[PDB]
Symmetry: T
Subunit: 152 residues, 12 copies
């Protein structure tokens, strides 16, 4: 019963690429009073997660892995879900999706943290922790924006 | 194809291209690793900015940008290949140049169309991007030991 | 109108717009006070710079820019109203977008005019500005929960 | 009350205020979370600076600043309450403004006192701070949909 | 008059002044074009900031700032003249200095009034501005080969 | 005590420590006034940052930070004393070191607890902070002419 | 053709660049400092215009002149050694004259490049003429003249 | 006698003080060499800037600043002594503080005078300087192990 | 291998030899990669110099006494150095660089394990952060050499 | 020798510094802004030059003059109170005159320092003379003259 | 040849060299395109600055700098060749080094001359430049697989 | 000795010196810990830069820099001792000064030698470094209560 650090990292490269595009979807299609605040917030998320992705891929490379490097691979491997923007969505619906995705990444990183601890891959371990630190901070902030406690 | 459809097609293209830039940067080997790794980081930023600007312009003209990997793949003319076989720096750079040329030529089509449509803003935006594309084609071709239009 | 008269009209328009931006920023109330206040400061700078560049271009083409409030009022098509009755964030923003729309459309007329006259520089200048105006129309309309061309 | 006792009272007040700013930043929820979160960060720095300057000025006139939480609590007129029941953004902001108004008025008493005593430096220091407090009252009341002195 | 009425008058004045600063920058000819052009750019920023701060202070004291060109023209004591006949550097600078002297003298009245009303903040604000104005009077008069108070 | 209670306790500690740093900076006398005054400014910012991070981490895990001086005093293990008797630079520094040692030890406790709890993020955060605390312990002990663990 | 025009500008710009240095080095009078710093700015700006023109030429498959000999044989911008003392006004009139020459040639380059469908070169030249026209207004204003007088 | 006389006297003082700061930095010996050396460099800039501001203010009120070493020597109340016998850091610092106290007390006289004359600008300027002077007095006295008013 | 202090002190030694070697490579390098690699050696020198200082300061923080002389560094380093006598290619110089990075990686791995057993959490994360960088360099330098990182 | 030379410069530069301030404060005319900023730059540079001369004096076991009295009693740079109104040109001539004096004295200091084998002081003075000569050119050009006229 | 003639000769040389630098950058092909392209950009600025400094030094010594291309061609010893046949990066680099070596040797003669003339300033200026030229000679020779004096 | 031998000897010296500078920073205790720690950090950078420059200069003249600890130890005249017995800040500083003196004296010999050889670049390079060394000798000797040459 095992997925390895390589497979976990590679899965996150896929995930992050899907998330990156989803962040653009949110930024592009957002409407409402928080358009500017959230627009700039999506710009920040985009950089951060793009940087996370780059770091995850570079870490994978550093451990002898081969990162997915096509949209086809990303789609075939991501657990992060994407949907085309057909029906109009509220800022809250968009933010819920964003939060939902952050939660998925947090939980998966949590699995990656445990795995990486079990395999003795200390570097990947700290890297994932550093990222979860930020994911958790965003979960609190975006849930706060949605009028909810970070766990609900 | 109208301006909306053209721009939207470039959103798809640029997204595929951006990932391919990552592929090049990640998988590159050889003596030009550092110099080209840094050059891919710059390309990634620039083409990412291009993409965001294309999407925003599309949005500004009442369009609806493709905003999913699926849509990007369904609509892109820029091709992508999984990195299975090792490729040399020059094979990677030829693919980069090839894509830059595709983008150049498509932008050229977009420049025509957008002029025909009287969309002066989209027109200048495409021109500024082709300006950069052309410069990259020269630089990358020169790196490969070739003339820009060779 | 010729290029000079068009530019001069924009000098007027922009000056009226600039002061309307301040009106919005000063008189705004509601939850969006900070976000919108900062955005009005941004818009004031940007349009103040547009105005200065329009005036400078007008000077460069041998024109004589309007350089008084009487002249601006006498010539602008951008309307202004004293802040007497309390207005909603939405009412102020719609007046802002309405003005941006007017600028966009006038700029489009100026772009056409300047193209016919062979004034390539003024043409590109107006295009760059429209690029910005169209971006703002998308952004503020999105803020208002509307599509850009709605 | 002399200048020393007034300044020391503000050292107490500011420290209570600074913590209350954190309380607001930490516990705020709603659509204004980001805009107000950053605005609290700014207020924290500002009032922290104000506090340090007040303490430093008190030092400079031969005074002995309160420099413990117990002293702050025993001496502050600015009130604090543990965050037990959930509060709306508006409730938190009314508390903020109430505190800013308390500071304004106390500073006004300090301005008068410091004039009487001929302590010109502390006078100007307090006026510079009141300048800021008044601006903030205007801004935060505007955010609350209210006029500054209403 | 009162503090509110005074500041509102200055909002009018500063807006007329700021436009006049542009007039001067735009129409300036002679060996001093560059040095004076950049000095007008600076004056524009500073007095635009002064205007913004005066209006914000007015807001802060429960006032309602003039927010239209019409209101500025109906209320300003600062005179404006369209640029019809060519003016020398000299004539334009004399108008500039003349206007700075008007603002200094009015601010001196405003300083007096604000002191009588006990509006310490508005008082310091107007003093800070007069400090600047006086410096500019010295500088610009020196530029003109004149002593500051001649 | 769980992670939430541990963190909250540190929010209390850090707030007391923050104030104490201010006490030390304000009341310090002697030849090291400048060097240690600047070093206190640095520690104030660093520990204020640690505090805010601890509180935000606490929020991130579903906790409710102490957010009043009363709560900080009721819960901190970091002790404070009003500055009554004059203290030497060394007495102030020993108090500082003593507090840094208390924090190190408590953070060590927090690190072990947080590891047992599988709260990896809080673990790393506390480690990064202890890294800095240990460095300061070395530096201040060396200033005092002693070894770090002496 | 676009290549030839761009190449001609590489020549022109290099002559202009050196003339800007001539003006800055040899200038005298009360405007020495203001105009000295303005020459510094012009030098950088036209040096960058020059490099962009050459880079554009390269991008379209051209071969830029890359020697002083080639710049001299190909530039329409005139240069003279500084032998007789010249006034700041005479130096500035030479600068303005050169700017107008560049403007007028860029205008021809803009027409040509519009005819050839070289949209990129077209925008580039437009962007540069924008600058050139601003400079002409400024330097003419400095000279006490209207921009087109 | 008047504001002009006072400011001119300060131009003299500051010039003597500025050189004295250089004397202290150059001749300084002991463990505090670096810390005080850097502090003298800061003082030099600050008082140099004060001097420049004083002179500019004098010029702005129609005065004629002393502009020669001879004039400064003939009018300064700040004393200077050639460095003949070696002086301790303490001796040097006490002379610094002594001078700082002289400047404080003269500025105090300058504040009253300038208040009498209704020279609000000069008043604020002097108050701003006294603020800094008082802060320095506190810091330097603290460095010497003394309270500020001891 | 067994005391955190001794492990860190050994790395103070290692890093100072590595630092000098980084200079050796930058000074003596020839070939088409001179500029790119020259700049890269400058970066390595700063980073490893910083790593060295952090290691020594950490050692100080835990009550240790860092080696503070060249003789001590040379008597205790496991990083080997050779005077530049015979001309070496860019590849030979880079392989020695990579070889040294691998040595440091493996030793840091040992230090990470030890420091974990000892409950020295601070030194643990410090070593991990460094190994993160070492690993990135091994990937980059190996890639430059046309090899996979675990090559 | 070197010590006496450097100390004489500390005096000179302090007199110069104040003269730069005189010029900046009292200047009138169309060059007020450009020359006012130029005086601020000169103030910094010669202030830095002075501090470096004094620090070098210190470094060689010297004792710098550190009082206005000492500067006045030792400087060869002359100063005069501003009584009568002076033109920008008269002010600039006085500035140039002083720069010339500093140049010439540094020339002697460079000679002496070379003979005494004080290589550091030598380079320091040469670096300053570099700057002084650049300024002599610029200010003379401002005044419509050649640098050595 | 005197210092004036020597420096003037270098003004010529540097201007030829600077254009050669651009030739190399523009026409370069191969794997080293990017590394050498940025290195040419650096050399261009540096040598442009050397040129400007040399001409300013010449001016400072009462000289008259060559200030036309014709004068530079008439006077330069640095030779230039139009880019007609394709050259290898090696050929271009050898020309670069060759030119750097000529500059070095000429500077050496200028150093001797300038020392004989007692022109200490020009001497140090040339030495500083020779420092840089020598460093480049090493670096470019190293890039070509050769020792600096090979 | 020749220039190559001299430079190489300083490569060795500087590397021993740099590590001794770290020894001093690491092991220092007392009230001067912060000020001197920061000053060792600056010396470390400076002397590391000097060392790199010396090595690059040696390369530039056809030399072969020592590039191993072994070689540095074998060739350095700068002495090093492991830190076994506790040393005072004083003893550490005296060693630093002693070493700076040794470097100053050896650079002086290097300046003489390099002047005889006509290596003007190395000459100026050594002088610029001796400038710095002499300044530090003054500063650190001042710190120790001594005159530079005592």
């Amino acid at each position: 019963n095992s997925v390895d650090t390589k497979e976990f990292l590679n899965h996150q490269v896929a995930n992050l690429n899907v998330f990156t595009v989803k962040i653009h979807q949110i930024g592009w299609y957002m409407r409402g009073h928080n358009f500017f605040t959230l627009g700039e917030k999506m710009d920040d998320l985009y950089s951060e997660f793009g940087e996370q992705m780059d770091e995850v891929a570079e870490r994978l490379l550093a451990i002898g892995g081969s990162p997915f490097s096509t949209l086809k691979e990303f789609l075939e491997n991501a657990s992060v879900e994407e949907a085309p923007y057909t029906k109009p969505k509220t800022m809250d619906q968009l933010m819920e999706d964003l939060v939902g995705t952050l939660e998925l990444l947090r939980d998966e990183y949590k699995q990656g943290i445990e795995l990486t601890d079990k395999e003795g891959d200390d570097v990947t371990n700290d890297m994932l922790i550093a990222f979860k630190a930020s994911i958790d901070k965003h979960i609190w902030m975006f849930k706060a924006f949605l009028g909810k406690a970070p766990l609900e």
